[PDB]
From Swiss-Prot, chain B:
Belongs to the flavin monoamine oxidase family. Its cofactor is FAD. The keyword Transmembrane applies. The modification N6-acetyllysine is found at K50. Changing C3S: No loss of activity. Pfam families: Amino_oxidase. Changing C190S: No loss of activity. Monomer, homo- or heterodimer (containing two subunits of similar size). Each subunit contains a covalently bound flavin. Enzymatically active as monomer. The modification S-8alpha-FAD cysteine is found at C395. It comes from the Eukaryota. One of its GO terms (biological process) is dopamine catabolic process. This is Amine oxidase [flavin-containing] B.
């Protein structure tokens, strides 16, 4: 029954909010729909794998909030293997390379690849992180899919193929499904193309020893009986003095304030009294999450390292079930494994197969790409289709179709009376990530502290000191990268 | 508690299913979220208006199922006023015309307008009504917005402007929001461009005397206590022998079968056990409804008729709050009124204003369009914003953004164990309309009768005899209309001669 704040959802965002409020002296309850905490993070333990992340997993430089929270909880990170060569597999053949970016040798193609990435970052600099709908060309870019943008910008099929794979991997959606404004904002608010795609010095630098699921589990340990598992919220009543929150199993909770820490569209699962205002009522029907199967194949040894491959593969083509892989071997060098993502329309297509049929397709692919028969002899397989989850709706995050961000965007974190909004989707830096979940949960908690007169308005949005354990190198561009002409630019110059 | 079939939703689709099942001898319960039946149809009665439809309203030729159902219930139709001239207002000026279509004088613009409508219908003929994702070019057309299709097809701004207003009016959404495959399907399954847009011989020919809300109300009268108002469904359990359906007010219903007769995305409001299959789970998050305010301004007299205007206005321009109007005077000639739609992004924009501020904007617009100061003296005003409705989500219907129809389309009316799907969105002829609600409700009911061994598979989909009261004239094209070249076609024909 009675408390100061009810938090709906026990993922990273809901747990970070509740921890903050608890640490401030307020009485808090977390209502969680599933029989576990963690939401879009999930760590499986069994004897074969020891532990494995089946949801969110990677952290890296500039993600200072998730790094500080995990450190305080007693977690350690380790580095993803990127010692040996990366592989770019294109038109049925493998090209090993070093550095973050796959090299291009044809000169025209070179100019086209260079101009595409540069243009993405240029366009991003006109987009405010906390208000993308205030971009000078907000409407024009929002009324256009990423597919239309790629068609205009890319003068070669080679650049257009790589840019498409880039979109599919970042947001688990097809280029024709997503707004150009929304995708450019998304990349920008992660620090740009280089920062988002890199292992070393980027979003994929590190993982947590023991799994990322420990973040939510350890906060639940701190909160004890305040966390209520298998309590899906069905009903929120704001007509009276205290807010009334009802669960599916017929319990009633009473509070001064609520934080909703669930993906925006999952707000549909709740019946509101009084009805939601018009813009939010419609927004929550307009914001799907992407589609992905995360798959991990285990091997006796990390045999790719013997051929001077790190295990990172960038794989083009319609036939490949998996477009991107990373080494998932434990820091000690055992439980050798390759992690890969089956993205967007391939997730829909390959979900019809059996677990065993998917394993066979992956092994045959890895054998071609790595040039090794050893890939045909897996010792174990784990996978998770996020599309089938009632209380997630997909992964990694919410995407915006064309027209939606400019029309409904400003409503995402706008309070509805005594309901405040957290969840990674409402963040302004690494929104879509575990980092964004922490930002949003702690910000929504402070909005409530301010409404209670406990802190100045000044203190709702708080900056984060840089991690000493995971420092960031700055992103640099060369003179030639900055000044080489586009393909049409070279044509004008002719 | 116990019955044969629980129907979720008391709109036209849910009420048509329940009536069919009841007439067959089964015990049915209808669970309705609101304190009223009718859903996206709603008839307001007060002394000033007598009655007025604030939601779905128009019916016309080829809509035989809604006409038969209403006739059996004892309802009458009357004809929408189209006796005098239509108006096309473009670039701040009005051009009166007769006939269904605004005339085009410039021969280039004329070739462009002719080729646009023709191409829409040509592309539609490649799209199966019952399976749009089977079109030969389904993927290509689905990966493209209507805005991209218009940019490629229309070689004049004038054709592009009119085509845009056409999309906004048909599906209450912007061209950049909707799949090209979905929109071409939607028009095709209503019988094509002419049938969808027309008053005389089209979708807008008629209304029901007394209002369309009487359809649902009269079925409720037939069913008596079997209809449960203010019972929003929150939970469906299929793990046991009988299906368990729970409501928000804590009642439990038990049944052999369930029909879900709610817009697909409103399925999100229900918690399922076991969880929905993957494709449905994701589909219901990908299918929004459009945005519209329906507004009716009353006058002492239908003064536009005196100037030889019927009251139909097609109004282009960003400044105009309303893009389309119809005479909404009663068949007896009293309660003179103009009905207009505020569509898509304007519904969002103008919802910020007060009721009085919106009234003033409309009157000032009608005064320019009709050239009449009388338009500035309204006697009464009614309106309804559908965007604010928790148990509709918008109006008129569900649209599909790019990429969705080909990936998730085939799952819309696919049964999930003992749950069968009705609602106008699952229809194959006039989906989006009251007609489609009847088709879908009656088909879902017969799917259940078949599962119960009461009818052959053969009988699930049933054709409908043509209405004798509202007959359909066929849609004809002239020789010139069929064979005049497009703009690029004329240009090719100029490249060829010179050589
Ligand atoms: C899935 C995934 C994958 C596969 C991968 C990845 C990911 C994912 N990511 C993402 C993450 O994870 C995220 O962001 C996070 O986690 C989020 O968080 P939040 O905000 O908190 O949210 P969530 O989790 O979802 O939670 C929520 C909750 O709630 C609940 N509910 C619902 N409903 C309800 C409830 N309750 C009560 N009632 C009701 N009604 C649920 O259940 C839950 O719990 C990521 N991230 C990062 O950071 N990293 C990584 O790695 C990741 N991953 C990704 C990527 C990869 C590559 C590149 C990029 C990215
Ligand atoms: C809105 C509108 C307007 C404004 C106009 C119009 C329209 C609309 N339209 C459409 C119609 O109306 C429709 O289609 C119909 O109505 C549909 O039906 P259905 O399918 O049945 O569906 P609904 O109605 O929605 O119902 C449902 C129900 O359910 C319920 N719920 C929900 N949720 C829930 C429930 N319950 C329990 N639980 C839960 N969870 C609700 O409440 C409801 O009741 C139209 N149509 C026609 O035909 N005509 C016309 O006129 C119309 N309009 C239109 C137009 C105009 C112009 C052109 C074109 C068109």
């Amino acid at each position: 029954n009675k408390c100061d704040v009810v938090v709906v959802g026990g993922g990273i965002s809901g747990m970070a909010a509740a921890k903050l409020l608890h640490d401030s002296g307020l009485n808090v309850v977390v209502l969680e729909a599933r029989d576990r905490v963690g939401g879009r993070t999930y760590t499986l333990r069994n004897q074969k794998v020891k532990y494995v992340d089946l949801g969110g997993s990677y952290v890296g430089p500039t993600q200072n909030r998730i790094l500080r929270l995990a450190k305080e909880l007693g977690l350690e990170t380790y580095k993803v293997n990127e010692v040996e060569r990366l592989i770019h597999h294109v038109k049925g053949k493998s090209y090993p390379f070093r550095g973050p970016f796959p090299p291009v040798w044809n000169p025209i193609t070179y100019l086209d690849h260079n101009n595409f990435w540069r243009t993405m970052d240029d366009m991003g600099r006109e987009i405010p992180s906390d208000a993308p709908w205030k971009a000078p060309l907000a409407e024009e870019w929002d009324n256009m899919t990423m597919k239309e943008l790629l068609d205009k910008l890319c003068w070669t099929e080679s650049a257009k193929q790589l840019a498409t794979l880039f979109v599919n991997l970042c947001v688990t959606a097809e280029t024709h499904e997503v707004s150009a404004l929304w995708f450019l904002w998304y990349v920008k608010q992660c620090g740009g193309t280089t920062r988002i795609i890199s292992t070393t010095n980027g979003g994929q630098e590190r993982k947590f020893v023991g799994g990322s699921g420990q973040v939510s589990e350890r906060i639940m340990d701190l909160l004890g009986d305040r966390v209520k598992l298998e309590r899906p919220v069905i009903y929120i009543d704001q007509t009276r003095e205290n807010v009334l929150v009802e669960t599916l199993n017929h319990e009633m909770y009473e509070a001064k304030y609520v934080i909703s820490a669930i993906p925006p569209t999952l707000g549909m699962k709740i019946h509101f009294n009084p009805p939601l205002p018009m813009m939010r009522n419609q927004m929550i029907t307009r914001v799907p999450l992407g589609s992905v199967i995360k798959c991990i194949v285990y091997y006796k040894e990390p045999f790719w390292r013997k051929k001077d491959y790190c295990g990172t593969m960038i794989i083009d083509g319609e036939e490949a079930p998996v477009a991107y892989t990373l080494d998932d071997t434990k820091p000690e060098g055992n439980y050798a494994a390759i992690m890969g993502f089956i993205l967007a329309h391939k997730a829909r297509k390959l979900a019809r197969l059996t677990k065993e049929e998917r394993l066979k397709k992956l092994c045959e692919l890895y054998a071609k790409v790595l040039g090794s028969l050893e890939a045909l002899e897996p010792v174990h397989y784990e996978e998770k289709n996020w599309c089938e989850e009632q209380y997630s709706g997909g992964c990694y995050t919410t995407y915006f179709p064309p027209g939606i961000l400019t029309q409904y965007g400003r409503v995402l974190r706008q309070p509805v009376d005594r309901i405040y909004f957290a969840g990674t989707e409402t963040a302004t830096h690494w929104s879509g990530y575990m980092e964004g979940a922490v930002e949003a949960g702690e910000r929504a908690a402070r909005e409530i502290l301010h409404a209670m007169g406990k802190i100045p308005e000044d203190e709702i949005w708080q900056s984060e000191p840089e991690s000493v354990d995971v420092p960031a190198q700055p992103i640099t561009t060369t003179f030639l990268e900055r000044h080489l002409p586009s393909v049409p630019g070279l044509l004008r110059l002719i």
